[PDB]
Amino acid sequence: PENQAPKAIFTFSPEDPVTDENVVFNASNSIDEDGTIAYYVWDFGDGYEGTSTTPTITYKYKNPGTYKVKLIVTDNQGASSSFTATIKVTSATGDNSKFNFEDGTLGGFTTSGTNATGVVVNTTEKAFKGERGLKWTVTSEGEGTAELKLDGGTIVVPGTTMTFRIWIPSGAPIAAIQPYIMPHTPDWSEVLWNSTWKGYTMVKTDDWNEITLTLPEDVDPTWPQQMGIQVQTIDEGEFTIYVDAIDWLE
Ligand SMILES: [Ca+2]
Ligand SMILES: [Ca+2]
Missing domain, CATH: 2.60.120.260 (Galactose-binding domain-like)
Incomplete structure (x- = not known):
């Protein structure tokens, strides 16, 4: 009865953040079809990473640029999937x-x-x-x-x-x-x-x-x-x- 890997997906808001503005990443459409999701692991693309047992997280980028945000979702049996999307951050001032x-x-x-x-x-x-x-x-x-x-x-x-x-x-x-x-x-x-x-x-x-x-x-x-x-x-x-x-x- 082989374990199915969970499905990893996220969106974020705002679409076009500035430096030091909160971005809410929302992985709530992630799902394990034959179990439950144990945790969400985020790589924000700037050197920092974070985890949560719940599907949302908020984050601020200090410098402008284009960042690759990778989410890994892991189920109750240790199987995982990843979803990667890009976020562009522009300067708040200047x-x-x-x-x-x-x-x-x-x-x-x-x-x-x-x-x-x-x-x-x-x-x-x-x-x-x-x-x-x-x-x-x-x-x-x-x-x-x-x-x-x-x-x-x-x-x-x-x-x-x-x-x-x-x-x-x-x-x-x-x-x-x-x-x-x-x-x-x-x-x-x-x-x-x-x-x-x-x-x-x-x-x-x-x-x-x-x-x-x-x-x-x-x-x-x-x-x-x-x-x-x-x-x-x-x-x-x-x-x-x-x-x-x-x-x-x-
Ligand atoms: Ca599963
Ligand atoms: Ca100018």
């Missing part, structure tokens, strides 16, 4: 992004445009993470283009996915917006255009938009790079875009 703007600086960012003029300041009015970000005000005179840009030595290695956060307002005279990275030879004889084109109708207005962009792997790693955000304007008008927490790995 902003550790590659471009976080928390030092009050422009981070080397400048503006340019044609049939449009941009100004950029470091602001506390809106931020995606931390207390600060960029506030980019564009005055367009009609059909044109405006850039918020960083020149442009070697910003990222080829293959890198960048994440931009952009607060886009409603009722703006814009057709499209696009984060871009533009590698070029030092003398501009060869230029590569990489961008994530978003139409103005395909955008969350009066809200933060998370847009990713990959620099392709086959780009020459020695080429200087311009990274930025480009807006296409379609009519006269003044509008303000917020930019913060531009981030990538390595």
Whole structure:
């Protein structure tokens, strides 16, 4: 009459915790079909482990990151099963992004445009993470283009996915917006255009938009790079875009 191993499963809340916030892990749908569960053993993925004879446990992560949480459930006869899930923890305060703007600086960012003029300041009015970000005000005179840009030595290695956060307002005279990275030879004889084109109708207005962009792997790693955000304007008008927490790995 061979013993069946118990079934191990858990969920957690909140789905998106911050550092030092309580997460409740709930293994209550775990079950032994032919006996009872004796205990629940948890590995929180950060160096700490814990056990309970009951299916819930609460836990706090001190540092941001992505943790693998492994649950082992053991029945009254010593048979066990495991279930592993991932939890992402973000910083409760501050902003550790590659471009976080928390030092009050422009981070080397400048503006340019044609049939449009941009100004950029470091602001506390809106931020995606931390207390600060960029506030980019564009005055367009009609059909044109405006850039918020960083020149442009070697910003990222080829293959890198960048994440931009952009607060886009409603009722703006814009057709499209696009984060871009533009590698070029030092003398501009060869230029590569990489961008994530978003139409103005395909955008969350009066809200933060998370847009990713990959620099392709086959780009020459020695080429200087311009990274930025480009807006296409379609009519006269003044509008303000917020930019913060531009981030990538390595
Ligand atoms: Ca059993
Ligand atoms: Ca920030």
